[PDB]
Amino acid sequence: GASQFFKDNCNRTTASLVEGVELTKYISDINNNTDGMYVVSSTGGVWRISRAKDYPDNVMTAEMRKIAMAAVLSGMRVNMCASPASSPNVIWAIELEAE
Amino acid sequence: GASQFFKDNCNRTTASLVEGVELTKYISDINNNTDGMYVVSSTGGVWRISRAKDYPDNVMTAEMRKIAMAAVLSGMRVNMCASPASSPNVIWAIELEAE
Amino acid sequence: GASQFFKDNCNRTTASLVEGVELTKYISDINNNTDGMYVVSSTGGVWRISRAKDYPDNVMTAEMRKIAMAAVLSGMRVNMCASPASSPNVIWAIELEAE
Amino acid sequence: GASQFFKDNCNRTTASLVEGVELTKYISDINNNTDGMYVVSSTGGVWRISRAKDYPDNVMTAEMRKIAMAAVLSGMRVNMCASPASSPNVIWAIELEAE
Amino acid sequence: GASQFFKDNCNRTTASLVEGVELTKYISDINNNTDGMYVVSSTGGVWRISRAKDYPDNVMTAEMRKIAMAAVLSGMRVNMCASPASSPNVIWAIELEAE
């Protein structure tokens, strides 16, 4: 489940905390309208991974992409801090968990 | 099979949707007349991977290459949104599926 | 245990050595007040990974991220040289340990 | 075996087609006149991996290094389009095969 | 042990050949006087991985880090061309072996 750190850091934002998600699809799309990176959960949820060109969020967002692909390949679950009202929703924090 | 999101997104374009493709070869070529990144399926179909030097699509196309190689290395299948307006067809979106 | 080298180099700083830690979560966060990369141990301790924009520390901190993610995915333990001057404590050195 | 596509593209070059090669060593060297990336086959052949500073071949050559490393670590075979009469030979195209 | 190519290339320098090293720790350190990337063997020896800011040695030094981490993670041995001038000795060339 979500570490207390992660939980605490999400609640103080107007985002929703999603725990123990299994990601089953990883999407790269450069079509004009959908241009971006997406993940889909086992339950059919869809999320957009945040993007950023400038330091330092270009680092965090790169790692988000690494975490998402690692979850899909290995079946490890993730916890997410994501916007609560949109389709697809956007990821603002993600936590890869071994246990 | 392809997620609904992925399906929906490809259906809005001139491109066609290819599902359940097993990629078995990954190619990098720097000969000027055939320069490019390609993948080959178990049936011998060929696709070119999109490239881009500018942000943000240089990010998405880097992720397409990562997805392509992951699929070849692990046998995991992919869903593609490919444009038939070039030989080989060009990948505009790709979906890695565990499930 | 930490190598002699690591041990000795951490001793000559104002930070503390943490040995044989099992990392079980890896976090990327772009929320306003939490912006960064974090790791969580099997014992619920939390650390911030250092970051740097310019050469050569950009290389070192990139490797810290690769090491931390490798530890989470493989169960390999780490040794850390962390400064407790911040909360969460910040990693100044990290040692991946296998065989 | 080399895909038909890969064969045809090397067929249209001045190179040699090298099939079913097992790569067993991966080398990085920064010494003055031997500097470069090289691979060695199970039977002792040596090839230099092409390098390039400029887009788009900087992308292709990075992918060639990734394919080389993957073949070494996983024992997967590669097909090459390479110079035939030097030592080391240079690789102009490489195909990673799961098949 | 080392390929003959690797041996021949090291022997043209002031550096020394070290063979069949099993690396067991991988270190990233940004502390002021110990700022760099290091590896430690099963035998307890320590080496510094070369760093480079500009093309083309930034490519080769990036590959050295990749090789070093792979060795630690997989237990695969390396051969190194290392200069005894500095302490710890500096890796100028490295060869990952599979077979």
Curated annotation (Swiss-Prot), chains A, B, C, D, E:
The keyword rRNA-binding does not apply. GO terms for molecular function: toxin activity. Disulfide bonds join 10-81. Keywords: Disulfide bond, Enterotoxin, Signal, Toxin, Virulence. GO terms for cellular component: extracellular region; host cell membrane. The keyword Membrane does not apply. The biological activity of the toxin is produced by the A chain, which activates intracellular adenyl cyclase. Heterohexamer of one A chain and of five B chains. This is Heat-labile enterotoxin IIB, B chain. It comes from Escherichia coli. The chain holds residues 24 to 122 of 122 of the full protein.
